[PDB]
Chain length 449, copies 3
């Protein structure tokens, strides 16, 4: 609920605390079926425009079914497979079951009397079935008596329009499945209406607090979901929707922000830099910390973070000590070094870190008062309380207007504890104790000779 | 207007000059409203197909409004926030104002008599208002007399069709806003027709030369714009369109192309490489140079470059001296080094740089004459005048057919001025003077022992 | 057909063999035309709803043509240009020909009598022409007699509906071309129906085995295609479709998987790591090996790999010896080193490599038996035969269920042949023989002093 920040002048890094967690750890597969009509082309003596329009829309239904047929002749399993495996792997497991004999018949039988069921497949997976569109009922009852005879009966213009409305959702689903090789993400309203999604959430074998969680963030749920095309078989079109399951909930999370920490010598060519690494989202997870390096693997909405553990890292709970004591031996606090003194800025949750070097004009202004702070050479921070923009050189960043308390922790910049001459000025991903050992090694290389 | 190129044999790099500039430095927010109809469901005795079709399309209007309602219950502010801040930050500032009382009433009053207005909000922002669709007028005048009574009146088939045409734009806007969590980019023709966009450009408080600039490049303007969902309130649907403002215009720009510069010893394992860094777009901006490292942050159309300063860098105007004298002390000309002699090629604006090493078959051919040039070991360049393709190994690159003059600047490759034994063969982002100091340091490590 | 795997305990890497190849080496351009109607607005005394609906849909046709007109006033050539050149370069060559006089007349004449032709342009390119929609015929025959007179004739509701159906494909094509600046990929069903694509494949001057190849993988073909907007001219709308040409077919391919290989000392701060580089897809191509570093540049479907040679590398056929003998001098087998002992896992084609270090809980379980293997410190591998998931820390990966034989090649991990004290613990992209020379250099730096 209450968001806070802490800027560490000593390491040129800030930590935004107070966020609650929702980590994806599992998948809920669910089958979405469309009852289709097995009709073959029935060309009849037809002339007046109502039969032509009906026959045209019927051909769009036929090409949509044959397009779905060449789509299932190839199950590419193209979703993920990026060394972290497939994400859709779980949903693919349901499609291989649907290809079994009698398996399309079980969901077709469970949905013989009701629209929404639960079906126990022949592999132990209890999936929830949904039937979102019924074209077999409409084509076999309202359309076949028009095209079945020798000469076509004249359908009313109302039938032509009602048939374009029902057939539309099928046509759009085949269009998405065609351009994406059967696997789509996010799940569009054609794949699942907000109304159908909320009905699937209410029926899940999950706690009521988790149903309130997923229902208040349906947009986040859509963006973290997959729609996988299954099978066209026995007057039934089936495709699987994989919805995220959040195994870690309401757990502490914080966000690390890092910026270069250089020396401010006036001699060009004589400055050395240092930047804490592993910036990003950290969350408590099962006695450890789940770290998320990729920026888009975590969507944040309203004080909670929605992450996917597929692309994360597991760190000891001691990783937090780099935020309070970077010189602490329980944890190997890693940095990267260079001699590149370029000014830059990072917009944090409650303020902005500014690393200003050289002649760069770094400043922070308010919309109505103008410039309220001019930064000197070095690394600094400013709160958003009273600040609107931060400009560094020719670049203007907008400060985030989130409410929260910020705390400035004064301290000596650690780049000053290093002798410039005996410094590793090209180490990437080096630990503090690792760098102290390389400094002990270059000073041993100068003492002996 | 006139595009030229310069290849530097000494550093294996080329510069494409002559481009004019258009840098995004600001945002213009504008409110786009849709007048809605506050109706509640009115189930009536209905049987004949025209009432059923009308009631179906009316339900799609109702679900679209409730879907927009759960979308504004969560303002995620998910656009950007990538350490450069939010891009949509400015547009979000307008949405927080719309949630104020009386604020939906001001734009609703300014648009009470005209379609397009200007409205001064209660926070000092003078936004331009547009009213693109009027469903309150259509539902309350043409539809309510059909559904208001006890039994429904029979609407003509013309009313059913005209209502599907007007309601369509609302349905597509909710579909885009649902899959993208309220923030879309680019701005589609459903969000804003080319006709409405041109009318917004003509009304902006900008110079006439800037209106000619944005109007001749509307496609670039759409791709650099954002559509942010605001509020559903008081029979008004409002969402903000953020259009780019180009503060830097008709300013000099050039593009740096770099390729590995290795030695051509015949001994495998004995070659060292060097590659100028910071390749990309450079533009004069306010006495400095704005450098763009990311490739997609700059779209080039017809001799002008359209960049976003949010992801750029500010460099001293002296950065140009790496293109004429890399050994010049006013600027720290940075390179990266390695021992990886792999052949490769870079398609420039007017030609192609080819770095050929080992047994790789590097060649450049014309469509009707065949191979017109065979490259030897080392780094070379060829103009597009008479050249169609360049093949390196099993890879074929197409040479850009842009008209312009190319200039070949002969010179000794600088990788030959370095003794291989005493070379830093793993430096990344190192300056020329930095490398000379490391060579002075490894030669001091061999002289003393 | 038969997929196999080989895990090398000595280098912590695995190779998935048995895949067949389809590399894109060329482009087939083809022109897709829409015959348009040159009509100007003809406002007439109109009141009853059928004329209003017709005039509304006619205005959507007019704005679509003018939107296409400002789209061709700017040919941005924004597709690619990423230093590998443009991909669309070949297709752009056809658009510059269409702007020639008489050139729209040749395809318009070849398609005067048939729907599908071949046309020899005035630049030697024999392109295949397709005419997918005929609006000039429909507007000039069925619509002009209604709007041509002084007062409008009353069209039937059937005409209003048939005109919305034909005009729809034009409107969707302008919507895609507007948001993407004239260059779209993949090619949607609006740009080309699966039926039109299959008819273009059958007519190509390619072998019958290649037509069977592209027809069985149309989804892969769409995802690797481009649609480029050409010209609006002389009652003809033309745009070019670039389809991939696979010059390398049924050639051997394998996939390299790599994972960190560290020492298992119990002392924190004392471990050194090593990881083979250049992981990805390798395919035999013209006596060499085409290597693909980017992960998305190769789509794999059903034992064959579909790669684009534009973003690839050419390696000596000897690159395979890093998979059997990394210490072999014919090839410089490159690695990268560090001191970062973080546990991680890689899902291979037939199993999973697990690098477990520190206190991380690495394990592999079966769905019904539970944990079937607990990994110790070091690098290991497990087959998918009997294994369902692999968990490392708080991350759970799904093992790929592809059928195939796996082979575990036991051997001493090479990180143990290196003395930790005299190790380059920050080399990136270093060769084995390069590292042995740096170890010979740091041992010479300690022997002399
Ligand atoms: C090297 O490490 C030893 C062990 O702590 C210490 O006594 C010595 O002062 C260090 N020398 C340096 C950091 O130059
Ligand atoms: C090292 O730098 C000094 C100062 O310019 C110079 O005199 C000397 O020749 C250099 N030695 C090298 C580059 O080996
Ligand atoms: C250095 O290389 C030489 C040449 O093969 C070899 O004899 C010597 O043992 C090496 N020394 C090392 C690897 O420490």
């Amino acid at each position: 609920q209450n968001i806070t920040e802490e800027f560490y002048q000593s390491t040129c890094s800030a930590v935004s605390k107070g966020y609650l967690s929702a980590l994806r750890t599992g998948w809920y597969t669910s089958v979405i079926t469309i009852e289709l009509s097995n009709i073959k082309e029935n060309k009849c003596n037809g002339t007046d425009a109502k039969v032509k329009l009906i026959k045209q829309e019927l051909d769009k239904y036929k090409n949509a079914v044959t397009d779905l047929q060449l789509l299932m002749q190839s199950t590419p399993a193209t979703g993920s497979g990026s060394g972290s495996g497939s994400a859709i792997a779980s949903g693919v497991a349901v499609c291989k079951v649907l290809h079994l004999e009698g398996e399309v018949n079980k969901i077709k039988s469970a949905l013989l009397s009701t629209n929404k069921c639960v079906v126990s497949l022949s592999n132990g997976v209890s999936v929830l079935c949904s039937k979102v569109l019924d074209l077999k009922n409409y084509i076999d009852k309202q359309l076949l008596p028009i095209v079945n005879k020798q000469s076509c009966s004249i359908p009313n213009i109302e039938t032509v329009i009602e048939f374009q409305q029902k057939n539309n959702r099928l046509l759009e689903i085949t269009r998405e499945f065609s351009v994406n090789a059967g696997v789509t993400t996010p799940v569009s309203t054609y794949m699942l209406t907000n109304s159908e999604l909320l009905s699937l959430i209410n029926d899940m074998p999950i706690t009521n607090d988790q149903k309130k969680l997923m229902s208040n963030n349906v947009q986040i749920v859509r963006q973290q979901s997959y729609s996988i095309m299954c099978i066209i078989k026995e007057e039934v079109l089936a495709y699987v929707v994989q919805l995220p399951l959040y195994g870690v909930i309401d757990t502490p999370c914080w966000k690390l922000h890092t910026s270069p920490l250089c020396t401010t010598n006036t001699k060009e060519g004589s400055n050395i830099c240092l930047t804490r690494t592993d910036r990003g989202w950290y969350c408590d997870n099962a006695g450890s910390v789940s770290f998320f390096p990729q920026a888009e693997t975590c969507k944040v909405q309203s004080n909670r973070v929605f992450c996917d553990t597929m692309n994360s890292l597991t760190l000891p709970s001691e990783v937090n000590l780099c935020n309070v004591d970077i010189f602490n031996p329980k944890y190997d606090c890693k940095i990267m070094t260079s001699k590149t003194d370029v000014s830059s800025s990072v917009i944090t949750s409650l303020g902005a870190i500014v690393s200003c070097y050289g002649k760069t004009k770094c400043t922070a202004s308010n919309k109505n008062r103008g410039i309220i702070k001019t930064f000197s050479n070095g690394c600094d921070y400013v709160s958003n309380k009273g600040v609107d923009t931060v400009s560094v050189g020719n670049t203007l960043y907008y400060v985030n207007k989130q409410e929260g308390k910020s705390l400035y922790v004064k301290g000596e910049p650690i780049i000053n504890f290093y002798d410039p001459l005996v410094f590793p000025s090209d180490e990437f991903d080096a630990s503090i104790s690792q760098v102290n050992e390389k400094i002990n090694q270059s000073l041993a290389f100068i003492r002996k000779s």
